[PDB]
Design a protein around this ligand. Structure first.
Ligand code: NAG
Ligand code: NAG
Lengths: 98, 49, 244, 367, 105, 49
């Protein structure tokens, strides 16, 4: 199912090793369907590789990065959505997992 | 399609590649290494006890 | 070499029956409809237009794989050895050393040590295929990507390795009018072609006149380079000029 | 002591070529041919059994063959196999024949049954033996070198080889349904016959004795035999038990193969003269035989050639020797001596001609 | 059966790590980097000692006793730096990329 | 991971390698005891200090 009415948003992001960013996408798919999502640039990365969508709704994803002002083109069912975030540094100095 | 890609040798992290096949919906896929092993040459010289 | 197991063809009488798929090495199946049988008393069945026929076949290793096979090997540079005769005080002492500079052999208070070979040339490459009396500097197909009708027709790691990858295009054809047989298409192999055109044996094509010998593989008399050889010896075998 | 074929039957098979132009359903038709023995011995899977009577004795001079749906017996003396020359019977066991045989586009097997009627079956089979060593021949020599190869052996208790044996489904013989003013007379001859009819009454079902089912045609009915006692191996030519795949059964398939040496012939030694950095070889044949040569520089510069007649070849030799192999004999080594001279120290100069031994036509640039 | 070791207490500083460690029996300690060089180092220890370690830009491994290796990793540290009417930027460019990207300044 | 092992899972084919760096953490002379290995230089056969 192709999708229309895309508009993204960032509630609160912190560039770190964890699930440090959250994003929210408004969308309107044509029908029920499983479909993929891909980070176009390399800085942002999406954990959840693909999801089911139904139609006019909004969807929450989790992402990692390194940059504060994350400018973001993202391909979903191929449609380019643009977004921008002003992230924050984390509080812990040293974590163990890479 | 056949698709070639290259990934870093970081064990235990998901890398994402995207199959952008035209005429088809794209397919993202994840690779994660569990182990990479190197077995060198088994050339014995002698023993010691 | 391989064997094509073809069971007896399923004759589905007066209706249809399809095959339940399985992951055999090159499992292949097809049900032909509208076919007709024949036997002593005419057709084997009673219905005519509703006779269908299921046909299934596949390929396994042979009994000849138990003893006769070619082997694809990877190889690289060598740890050479040498046999060295010495006339010493009119006595023929023969030593055997390892021609890499990391073996000394002692005999009759004599400390022989050969050196590393001044070159490192071999007549071999990485991919080497052997059969039982000769070797070849040939590029076999990669394992699992075996091309049909050549080396790569069937593949397995060991003769004990029960898994066998194959690629031979065994696709069945429509059987004839009445003739109960199973027409399968042709399946050219590696032994059907390769043992007629082995051509340049490395025994016969070795540069610098080296010879080969199998079990284990060994190249002898590779006349290039030069061997450093050192000897330690005490003063007992010498004698002063006051005796000379 | 190998009495294991008691649940077997030597069935009859649709042979596509019995000679005489067209096909038959011959009792003796072959199915599976093996030629992986590098000497060229043939392992043949035939639709008969030999050396075993109806009571499954070890009488190794007879044979079983089914005919008219009855296993009858005959004698192995009439057995013939043929590519182009009258072949020899070597290995004799059940559904398997071993034979050593000459060239041929085709192959056929045939013999006479116990009613003095001889039958055969023919399959085209591109049987040309592979060459062994580096030579060919009319026949085996009584002398020669010993080269490794592989042959069949003569064992009957060969383990780890298997085929599956099970009950054959039916036997449609339409020589039974006769019309008695339009009737059907199923004549069972002491069997169990399935019938399939497009009429009233006993259209389908089973009987045990010769019955009369009236006012219907022969092709309107169908009378097949249902044997339920003896089994056959899974032939790919027979119809299957038409409910599922393999029904249970097992027998082993002996006459296995093993490594061996074999007598490869020698090679008649050629004659040879010498010349200025070159060699003339008059070489005799015995059969079409190859020879090869190389030299020992940086490159090997290989050549392989076949020869068939009295052939003379001249070969130039560089300063690193020459190697020429011919036949199964040892490869002949050669090394270029100073040729004869160019010249000695004459009272003129008359010198540079022996300078045409060491480096001819190069290093005269210094002159 | 060999003994294991007691897990030591540990805290972090900006791009470094302080590990306070408690033996009872004489016990080895070792550590290394995972870069192109190991910069391998080791000490025996017998008493309740603290140690300081410098985690590199790529990652550190420390091993105490017979335990499974405590692996450690550089996270970008903290916030004393933001976006305002002054810069508040260079501590960002002290946290990420020290000793260079100040060269472009 | 050397570029010669095609392997498939549910008719999906993979070919991996060869590695972009053939460096090893090994030297050529290795002593091995039943739990441990060491890069060192042992004396050759017959020249034992
Ligand atoms: C030593 O062996 C050579 C052949 O390798 C032989 O010619 C020579 O006579 C022998 N000398 C003695 C003393 O045995
Ligand atoms: C037969 O001999 C060859 C070498 O001569 C060997 O490679 C093979 O494994 C042997 N086979 C058996 C069954 O002994």
């Amino acid at each position: 199912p192709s999708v229309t009415d895309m508009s993204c948003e960032v509630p609160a992001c912190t560039h770190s090793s964890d699930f440090g960013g959250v994003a929210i996408i408004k969308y309107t798919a044509s029908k029920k369907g499983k479909c993929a999502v891909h980070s176009m640039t390399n800085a942002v990365t999406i954990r959840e590789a693909d999801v089911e969508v139904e139609g006019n709704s909004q969807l929450q994803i989790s992402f990692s990065t390194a940059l504060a002002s994350a400018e973001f083109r993202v391909q979903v069912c191929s449609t380019q959505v643009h977004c921008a975030a002003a992230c924050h540094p984390p509080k812990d100095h040293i974590v163990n997992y890479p | 399609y056949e698709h070639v890609t290259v990934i870093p040798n970081t064990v235990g992290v998901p890398y994402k590649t995207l199959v952008n096949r035209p005429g088809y919906s794209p397919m993202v896929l994840e690779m994660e290494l569990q182990s990479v092993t190197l077995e060198p040459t088994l050339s014995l010289d002698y023993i010691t006890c | 070499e391989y064997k094509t197991v073809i069971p007896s063809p399923y004759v589905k009488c007066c209706g249809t029956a399809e095959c339940k798929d399985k992951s055999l090495p090159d499992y292949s199946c097809k049900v032909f409809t509208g076919v007709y049988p024949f036997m002593w008393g005419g057709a084997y069945c009673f219905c005519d237009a509703e006779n269908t026929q299921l046909s299934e076949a596949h390929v396994e290793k042979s009994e000849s794989c138990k003893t006769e096979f070619a082997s694809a090997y990877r190889a690289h540079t060598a740890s050479a050895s040498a046999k060295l005769r010495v006339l010493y005080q009119g006595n023929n002492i023969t030593v055997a050393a390892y021609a890499n500079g990391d073996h000394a052999v002692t005999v009759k208070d004599a400390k022989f040590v050969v050196g590393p070979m001044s070159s490192a040339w071999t007549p071999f490459d990485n991919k080497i295929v052997v059969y039982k009396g000769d070797v070849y500097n040939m590029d076999y197909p990669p394992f699992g990507a075996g091309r049909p009708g050549q080396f790569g027709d069937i593949q397995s790691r060991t003769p004990e390795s029960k898994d066998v990858y194959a690629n031979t295009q065994l696709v069945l054809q429509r059987p004839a009018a009445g003739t109960v047989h199973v027409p399968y298409s042709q399946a050219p192999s590696g032994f059907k072609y390769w043992l007629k055109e082995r051509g340049a044996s490395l025994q016969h094509t070795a540069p610098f006149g080296c010879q080969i010998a199998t079990n284990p593989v060994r190249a002898v008399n590779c006349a290039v380079g030069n061997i450093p050889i050192s000897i330690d010896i005490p003063d007992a075998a010498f004698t002063r000029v006051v005796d000379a | 002591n190998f009495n294991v074929y008691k649940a077997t039957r030597p069935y009859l098979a649709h042979c596509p070529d019995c000679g005489e132009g067209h096909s038959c359903h011959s009792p003796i038709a072959l199915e599976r041919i093996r030629n992986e023995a590098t000497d060229g011995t043939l392992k043949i899977q035939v639709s008969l059994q030999i050396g075993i009577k109806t009571d499954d004795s070890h009488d190794w001079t007879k044979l079983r063959y089914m005919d008219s749906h009855t296993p009858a017996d005959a004698e192995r003396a009439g057995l013939l196999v043929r590519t182009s020359a009258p072949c020899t019977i070597t290995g004799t066991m059940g559904h398997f024949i071993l034979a050593r045989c000459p060239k041929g586009e085709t192959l056929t097997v045939g013999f006479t049954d116990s009613r003095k009627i001889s039958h055969t079956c023919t399959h085209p089979f591109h049987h040309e033996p592979p060459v062994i060593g580096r030579e060919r021949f009319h026949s085996r020599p009584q002398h020669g070198k010993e080269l490794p190869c592989s042959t069949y052996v003569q064992s009957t208790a060969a383990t780890a080889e298997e085929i599956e044996v099970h009950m054959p489904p039916d036997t449609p013989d339409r020589t039974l349904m006769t019309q008695q003013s339009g009737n059907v007379k199923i004549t069972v001859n002491g069997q169990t016959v399935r019938y399939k009819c497009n009429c009233g009454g006993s259209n389908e079902g089973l009987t045990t004795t010769d019955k009369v089912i009236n006012n219907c045609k022969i092709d309107q009915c169908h009378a097949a035999v249902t044997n339920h006692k003896n089994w056959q191996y899974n032939s790919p030519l027979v119809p299957r038990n038409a409910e599922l795949g393999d029904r249970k059964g097992k027998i082993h398939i002996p006459f296995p193969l093993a490594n061996v040496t074999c007598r490869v012939p020698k090679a008649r030694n050629p004659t040879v003269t010498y010349g200025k950095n070159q060699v003339t070889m008059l070489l005799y044949p015995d059969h079409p035989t190859l020879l090869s040569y190389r030299n020992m520089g940086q490159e090997p510069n290989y050549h392989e050639e076949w020869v068939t007649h009295k052939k003379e070849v001249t070969l130039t030799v560089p300063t690193e020797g020459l190697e020429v192999t011919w036949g199964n004999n040892e490869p002949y080594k050669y090394w270029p001596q100073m040729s004869t001279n160019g010249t000695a120290h004459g009272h003129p100069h008359e010198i540079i001609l022996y300078y045409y031994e060491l480096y001819p036509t190069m290093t005269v640039v210094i002159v």
